[PDB]
Amino acid sequence: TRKTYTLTDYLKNTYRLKLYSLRWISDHEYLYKQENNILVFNAEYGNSSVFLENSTFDEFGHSINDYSISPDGQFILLEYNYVKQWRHSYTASYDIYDLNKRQLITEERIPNNTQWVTWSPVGHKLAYVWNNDIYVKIEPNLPSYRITWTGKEDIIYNGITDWVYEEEVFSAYSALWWSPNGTFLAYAQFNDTEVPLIEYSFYSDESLQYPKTVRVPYPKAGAVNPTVKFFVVNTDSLSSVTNATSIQITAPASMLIGDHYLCDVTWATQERISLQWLRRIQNYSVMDICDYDESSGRWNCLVARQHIEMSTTGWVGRFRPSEPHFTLDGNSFYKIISNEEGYRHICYFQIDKKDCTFITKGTWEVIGIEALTSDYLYYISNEYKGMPGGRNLYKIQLSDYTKVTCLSCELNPERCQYYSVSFSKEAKYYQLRCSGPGLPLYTLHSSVNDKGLRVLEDNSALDKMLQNVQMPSKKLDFIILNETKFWYQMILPPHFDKSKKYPLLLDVYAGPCSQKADTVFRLNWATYLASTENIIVASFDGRGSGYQGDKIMHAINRRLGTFEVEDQIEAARQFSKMGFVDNKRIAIWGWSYGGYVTSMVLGSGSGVFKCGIAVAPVSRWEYYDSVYTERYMGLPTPEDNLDHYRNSTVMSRAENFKQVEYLLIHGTADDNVHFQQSAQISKALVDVGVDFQAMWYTDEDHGIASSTAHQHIYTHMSHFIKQCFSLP
Amino acid sequence: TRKTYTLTDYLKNTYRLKLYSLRWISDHEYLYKQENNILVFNAEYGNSSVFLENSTFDEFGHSINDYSISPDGQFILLEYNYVKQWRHSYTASYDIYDLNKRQLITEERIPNNTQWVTWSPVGHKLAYVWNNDIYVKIEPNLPSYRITWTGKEDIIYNGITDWVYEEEVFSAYSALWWSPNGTFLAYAQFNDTEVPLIEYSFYSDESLQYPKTVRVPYPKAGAVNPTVKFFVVNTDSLSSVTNATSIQITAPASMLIGDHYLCDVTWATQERISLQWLRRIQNYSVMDICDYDESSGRWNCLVARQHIEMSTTGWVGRFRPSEPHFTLDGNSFYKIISNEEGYRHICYFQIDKKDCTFITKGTWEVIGIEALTSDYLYYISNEYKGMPGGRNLYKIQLSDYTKVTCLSCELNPERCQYYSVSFSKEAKYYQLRCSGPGLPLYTLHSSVNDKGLRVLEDNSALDKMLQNVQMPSKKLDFIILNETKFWYQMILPPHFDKSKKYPLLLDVYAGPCSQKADTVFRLNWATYLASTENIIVASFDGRGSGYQGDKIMHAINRRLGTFEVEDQIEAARQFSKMGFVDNKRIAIWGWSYGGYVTSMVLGSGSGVFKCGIAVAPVSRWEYYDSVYTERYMGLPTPEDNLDHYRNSTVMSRAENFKQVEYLLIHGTADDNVHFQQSAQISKALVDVGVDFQAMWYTDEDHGIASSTAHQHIYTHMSHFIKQCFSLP
Ligand SMILES: *[C@@H]1O[C@H](CO)[C@@H](O[C@@H]2O[C@H](CO)[C@@H](O)[C@H](O)[C@H]2NC(C)=O)[C@H](O)[C@H]1NC(C)=O
Ligand SMILES: *[C@@H]1O[C@H](CO)[C@@H](O[C@@H]2O[C@H](CO)[C@@H](O)[C@H](O)[C@H]2NC(C)=O)[C@H](O)[C@H]1NC(C)=O
Ligand SMILES: *[C@@H]1O[C@H](CO)[C@@H](O[C@@H]2O[C@H](CO)[C@@H](O)[C@H](O)[C@H]2NC(C)=O)[C@H](O)[C@H]1NC(C)=O
Ligand SMILES: *[C@@H]1O[C@H](CO)[C@@H](O[C@@H]2O[C@H](CO)[C@@H](O)[C@H](O)[C@H]2NC(C)=O)[C@H](O)[C@H]1NC(C)=O
Ligand SMILES: *[C@@H]1O[C@H](CO)[C@@H](O[C@@H]2O[C@H](CO)[C@@H](O)[C@H](O)[C@H]2NC(C)=O)[C@H](O)[C@H]1NC(C)=O
Ligand SMILES: *[C@@H]1O[C@H](CO)[C@@H](O[C@@H]2O[C@H](CO)[C@@H](O)[C@H](O)[C@H]2NC(C)=O)[C@H](O)[C@H]1NC(C)=O
Ligand SMILES: *[C@@H]1O[C@H](CO)[C@@H](O[C@@H]2O[C@H](CO)[C@@H](O)[C@H](O)[C@H]2NC(C)=O)[C@H](O)[C@H]1NC(C)=O
Ligand SMILES: *[C@@H]1O[C@H](CO)[C@@H](O[C@@H]2O[C@H](CO)[C@@H](O)[C@H](O)[C@H]2NC(C)=O)[C@H](O)[C@H]1NC(C)=O
Ligand SMILES: *[C@@H]1O[C@H](CO)[C@@H](O[C@@H]2O[C@H](CO)[C@@H](O)[C@H](O)[C@H]2NC(C)=O)[C@H](O)[C@H]1NC(C)=O
Ligand SMILES: *[C@H](N)[C@@H]1C[C@@H]2C[C@@H]2N1C(=O)[C@@H](N)[C@@]12C[C@@H]3C[C@@](O)(C[C@@](O)(C3)C1)C2
Ligand SMILES: *[C@H](N)[C@@H]1C[C@@H]2C[C@@H]2N1C(=O)[C@@H](N)[C@@]12C[C@@H]3C[C@@](O)(C[C@@](O)(C3)C1)C2
Ligand SMILES: *[C@@H]1O[C@H](CO)[C@@H](O)[C@H](O)[C@H]1NC(C)=O
Ligand SMILES: *[C@@H]1O[C@H](CO)[C@@H](O)[C@H](O)[C@H]1NC(C)=O
Ligand SMILES: *[C@@H]1O[C@H](CO)[C@@H](O)[C@H](O)[C@H]1NC(C)=O
Secondary structure (H helix, E strand, O other), X not given: OOEEOOHHHHHOOOOOOOOOOOEEOOOXXXXXXXXXXXXXXXXXXXXXXXXXXXXXXXXXXXXXXXXXXXXXXXXXXXXXXXXXXXXXXXXXXXXXXXXXXXXXXXXXXXXXXXXXXXXXXXXXXXXXXXXXXXXXXXXXXXXXEEOOOOOEOOOEEEOEOOXXXXXXXXXXXXXXXXXXXXXXXEEEEEEOOOOOEEEEEEOOOOOOOOOEEEEEEOOEOOOOOOEEXXXXXXXXXXXXOOOOOEEEEXXXXXXHOOOEEEEXXXXXXXOEEEEEEEEOOOOEEEXXXXXXEOOOOEEEEOXXXXXXXXXXXXXXXXXXXXXXEXXXXXXXXXXXXXXXXXXXXXXXXXXXXXXXXXXXXXXXXXXXXXXXXXXXXXEEEOOHHHOOXXXXXXXXXXXXXXXXXXXXXXXXXXXXXXXXEEEOOOOXXXXXXXXXXXXXXXXXXXXXXXXXXXXXEOOHHHHHHHOOEEOOEEEEEEEEEOOEEEEEEEEEOXXXXXXXXXXXXXXXXXXXXXXXXXXXXXXXXXXHHHHOOOOEEEEEOOOOOOOOOHHHHHHHOOOOOOHHHHHHHHHHHHHHHOOOEEXXXXXXXXXXXXXXXXXXXXXXXXXXXXXXXXXXXXXOXXXXXXXXXXXXXXXXXXXXXXXXXXXXXXXXXXXXXXXXXXXXXXXXXXXXXXXXXXXXXXXXXXXXXXXXXXXEEOOOOOOOOOHHHHHHHHHHHHHHHHHHOOOO | OOEEOOHHHHHOOOOOOOOOOEEEOOOOEEEEEEOOEEEEEEOOOOXXXXXXXXXXXXXXXXXXXXXXXXXXOOEEEEEEEEEEOOOOOEEEEEEEEEOOOOEEOOXXXXXXXXXXEEEOOOXXXXXXXXXXXXXXXXXXXXXXXXXXXXXXXXXXXXXXXXHHHHHHHHOOOEOEEEOOOOOEEEEEEEEOOOOOEEEEEEOOXXXXXXXXXXXXXXXXXXXXXXXXXXXXXXXXXXXXXXXXXXXXXXXXXXXXXXXXXXXXXXXXXXXXXXXXXXXXXXXXXXXXXXXXXXXXXXXXXXXXXXXXXEOOOOOOOOOOOOOOEEOOOOOEEEXXXXXXXXXXXXXXXXXXOOOOEEOOOOOOOEEEEEEEOOOEXXXXXXXXXXXXXXXXXXXXXXXXXXXXXXXXXXXXXXXXOEEEEEEOOOOOEEEEEEOOEOOOEEEEEEOOOOEEEEEEEOOHHHHHHHOOEEOXXXXXXXXXXXXXXXXXXXXXXOOOOOOOOEEEEEEXXXXXXXXXXXXXXXXXXXXXXXXXXXXXXXXXXXXXXXXXXXXXXXXXXXXXXXXXXXXXXXXXXXXXXXXXXXXXXXXXXXXOHHHHHHHHHHOOOOOOOXXXXXXXXXXXXXXXXXHHHHHHHOOXXXXXXXXXXXHOOOHHHHHHHHHOXXXXXXXXXXXXXXXXXXXXXXXXXXXXXXXXXXXXXXXXXXXXXXXXXXXXXXXXXXXXXXXXOOOX
């Protein structure tokens, strides 16, 4: 008999997806790690040599976390003693190894506890951040030049982000931007002097007698934000002057009038940089285009080259204003912007004309611009078959916009409906990554005629293993509400029979611009629930969801905790109408925004749901950070949106939890959604005499992702769902 | 058929015990609050007058928390704006009402946020502590004299205790001691400069955007302790123009050689004070007897008058060295000390003689000396019927030790086996307070011929109510281990039938010198479990337990988490073989030390217990405070007892929790047993893959005693026990 996909299968990673992670080092070659050996592959023919033997660093004395090779191929940066900070940030030690002379460098080493390091884009200059200040090495073995002196722990950040810029603005820790040939180093400086601190206990190993208090500058909604400045230094002057001058580029007057953010930095040429700025009220953004002036040594941004983007129905961009892609000469650029119908499409700008030309259109959206050549622009969209949850690679002829070719749509239509892409240095080659609905498939292509050169990884090994398992199926479809299609997916038990009635778990996220119905193949907890426990696991993308235009996405503007919550309840009613759901056994669960929505649904008094699980939920918008929260909610003041901030809390719905079984879970060291949020939910439930189940996870963060904690939480949740559904 | 005692009855206080709380104001009269009116009673005849009408302060404008009348009856201190701190400490505002004028005092008022206030023992002087400094008022409407100028929040404490002296040494916030006629004010000063802080989050009301971090100087085991100094000031020679001179009494040389504590302060005469000092290794203590020298102005403690008290088998005293009771002339004293066999009895000392004479003896213990006259010493003991869990009042004739009279034993032997007492100022009269096994009974007596004057409160109203309820019964008996009897009690369901098999819950505390098997009448959770759920609730006093001599009490010296744990298991094993216990349904629960023992038992692998609940448990002795932990454990150093500190943790037993159902509960704002302790238990269980149930209580402290939290925790625990025992 074929076994099912069990909880242990999921928790012990018995059935692993194979990857093919490569790193392009040129237009024709990439690096790849095969059994600890770093190999160089030739793209055209597929042959390889050993770049770095696995035995090279056997006597190093430290486990190597990662490597980074200089762009000129002369040096390799070895990263070790990795200590994670937030989602992207960490500290590490670094050694540099000379490849041409086969030697480690012991002279003038990068310090321990270095926060960030990057090679220049050409050659082998290094910039790094240490104790919140920027340093530059022209040569790996020579003394560093200090660039900034103002760095101060938790206060002034030079060339790295503070908590909120890392998580909500840049999705990155770095704040250093080398010019294309490495002459200039641009950087941001953040000042968190008056930003309040979130404080929480960290217990550590049992040996630690007194708990540590972690203290992090973190602006909650409406609080004092960090301020920002932007600078550019000429690194070629460093060896000639004792102290090189950092030249400030100031934000536009339209930004300086109040609170604002720096939201994009993009080099256009050797001597031209674009900066995007965003008002704290995030429906107005300004792009400056700034040129170096040789005679004055200053950077000037002509107003004739300033571009404004605003939104009358919501915020700017999906999560921020989109990034520009400059043509080689730097005199024009392409950018995804919302069109007059509210659909995100590629627009083409000359740097000194304010009106752009849309080069794509239709009732679907461009997801990202991936590459730009003299002849073609390459982009990912969900055009194909009008499925907003699919992703394909297209190219558009720059001399004739009517000529658009899909490069991935027909490669394997049944197996592959969701693609991402990685182009070589000048887009001569590309790797396609298919992630579903079948098993992941990695292929390599040449851009001249888009020929498929070879299959890199086809997951044949996993395919063989899964033959002996009763795997669930997946249905992706839509329901029509008020003349609008809303997409859903169901993970269906093996041998699914529509004449029978199944328990159902609604797996919710539902944050603005999110998508939970797609064509991606996943091996996760839902796979187990469907395969082993015969539970249907459903998800629904309602109002506020992404990739379907602004009419849908902006529906929850200034009104979080309303329509997107109502639409999950309605989805459950619609699934019941399909005839194969046991209406006595409907449950709901989610994590973060999904935890908030789960809790709001459970507190609604709808009577639809028997039970639910909230993991690390938001409970009150005033407890979450300014950049994310205010994007959708504006400010929590009587003059703006305080009334809605106050009636969209989980705590106000406490009395209605009397009608449901609730399990509330939170990691105690969650720096993102603070434990505070669940502590206030539990207190409110206690105050009204509602019984519920709880679990804290000591020292876990938002991911609850340590190997043991991951296994424990899914085990605890599994018992709860099974009890709720009367399943042995 | 009649109702049972329900969970709601317990939680809503449906059946209330009546009290009779009086305060003696002389040898002949006492005060008593009846219907908010304060009445004065004549002891001899029982007639009364209204002292203060309940309407006097109708226009006061504040809710009055408490009152304190001056010893001369001329003033009343009114306490309001009460804000709780720790177990005993709080701050408050104070007004003073002048009874001669019938007016509130409007000048030179006691400051807001006052930490402690006390009248002199005679007359109407006041001493108070505000912002950690001591002040004295000679008359209530006159300006205060500032005694100390060194007070500093969290650092220097004058006349009040720090966290650990409050909880573990004096069981009080005050560290001020007036001489008998009010001439001198003695005080301690605590210095916490190098004591590390426990830090934990406090979430407050939902309106608070950022959690607050609470920081308390708290020495965990082996950490830097507070240091102490002792001073005496003459309040009769205070000046408006000169700062007050405090005279220091330094600790003896035998104490100064290392870390030590001040553990007792007792005035002997108007010009003689006794102090007891205790080494940090608490098996050695010294009493100094210090006389005022009217010509030098010093306090001199003659070496010839020092008294050493040491223990070879354990620590000194039950929880600290006992208080002396000085004779009229202050030249001799009576004190409870452990005799040669290890039983605590009254010893009679001359102040300048090394050897004392035991005036009581036997294999039972004196609980406390309650009053001393020239003729008689009055004491409470468990002599009667050799029952260590009973308490009676005795007097011994000081001129003839063969003449011992039990004053309470025969008053009402079926109803009353556990007494406490309150004597009038010079012991002309005493109130007896019986607390079981029947309903509490309060009576008044005269000392001259031990006449029973009147019944003050007999709880006949509650008796009438309980006749309509199926109440449980209580069995008190013993089992014999190694020729030693160990006492247990069982709360037995109504209509108990020994041919039937009942589930059993073992209610455990089992801390050193504790007693859980006694003759006290209680209305509590156990009452409900037995009455309504038909569960037997048993408790057992094994090794380490109190009031039965040092052989038993000192058995766990340097070895907490050994014999007292093993003895609970052995007890339950014996119970499980009794023909009326279902061996498949035995549970265990406890709070604090009881949570520790519950957890240690559940991690023992004994297999005896199906499930258990630990509330606010200790998990590792290095996490608890120095004064308590080291008394039993010594220091956590390789040279002392580190190995046993490391072997006695809950965390080390995590693997054994695989075969039990465990529920772990802790208040997040517990300043006593820190949330840290349970956070470490949960992390250990997660690390070995053990599933368990958890509940945190936001902003609750060690008591989990807010109205709503109290109701919630017992509701949660009730569901858990009922599910464990398969009860509907
Ligand atoms: C990073 O830290 C390591 C380990 O502390 C440093 O290596 C040595 O550490 C030992 C003590 O363990 C000391 O004797 C020296 O300070 C170090 N000696 C040498 C030869 O390195 C190391 O120095 C640190 N790295 C940098 C770049 O400062
Ligand atoms: C970062 O911002 C702070 C202001 O929030 C600046 O620090 C000072 O702030 C104090 C009080 O907030 C003022 O008295 C000063 O005028 C500010 N300036 C200085 C020089 O102390 C601070 O200067 C900023 N730091 C940097 C590096 O820009
Ligand atoms: C990197 O780019 C910079 C900026 O364009 C180049 O430096 C300039 O070169 C031009 C012409 O070669 C000179 O007129 C200027 O004096 C230079 N300006 C500055 C600020 O340096 C530089 O040539 C490039 N570097 C390399 C290695 O090609
Ligand atoms: C950006 O959003 C703000 C806040 O909604 C808009 O502010 C206007 O001013 C106040 C509220 O701040 C109201 O009296 C107006 O009705 C708001 N206008 C609206 C809601 O349309 C501001 O108009 C927005 N900017 C853009 C370009 O749409
Ligand atoms: C209890 O009763 C006695 C009277 O028997 C009270 O003593 C009397 O007090 C009143 C006024 O205070 C005087 O007029 C009498 O002269 C007193 N008589 C005696 C014999 O002393 C006593 O005050 C009462 N006590 C209380 C508390 O009400
Ligand atoms: C205790 O605090 C109260 C309130 O702050 C003080 O109240 C006084 O009366 C009003 C408000 O009730 C204030 O405007 C005055 O400043 C206060 N002063 C006086 C002289 O009454 C009160 O005084 C404080 N008590 C003490 C003893 O400091
Ligand atoms: C309270 O205790 C501290 C010691 O913990 C005393 O302060 C000094 O402590 C430092 C080390 O922390 C030593 O260098 C000094 O010798 C100590 N005292 C002096 C006077 O130098 C502090 O003085 C004490 N305060 C009081 C009021 O007793
Ligand atoms: C309270 O006790 C004190 C201390 O014994 C008494 O004051 C002493 O007694 C006499 C007063 O006549 C003097 O010789 C001493 O100088 C006093 N000592 C001090 C330290 O002041 C006082 O008399 C007692 N009070 C009463 C009312 O008897
Ligand atoms: C009080 O207890 C301490 C420690 O338990 C005893 O100290 C002795 O001396 C040193 C210092 O710790 C140790 O090496 C010895 O082993 C201790 N002797 C023992 C445990 O017998 C001290 O003896 C005890 N005091 C009394 C009166 O028994
Ligand atoms: C939960 N995911 C958390 C609470 C609310 C929704 C916001 N949360 C975040 O962590 C945000 N920092 C991000 C920001 C973007 C968009 C997200 O939907 C997903 C994310 O990875 C990137 C994290 C919410
Ligand atoms: C729990 N009860 C806690 C942990 C360990 C046993 C000690 N605990 C205390 O709170 C102590 N501070 C006290 C000290 C004495 C004796 C006790 O048994 C009871 C108490 O009220 C007085 C508190 C333990
Ligand atoms: C691949 O093969 C070509 C010859 O066919 C050779 O020139 C090249 O060096 C090889 N590349 C690698 C990375 O082995
Ligand atoms: C370098 O110059 C900057 C800007 O004037 C100044 O703040 C800093 O102190 C200087 N550093 C040194 C070492 O002179
Ligand atoms: C009393 O002592 C304090 C603190 O040293 C000082 O500020 C004050 O002036 C002193 N008063 C007199 C009268 O000396």
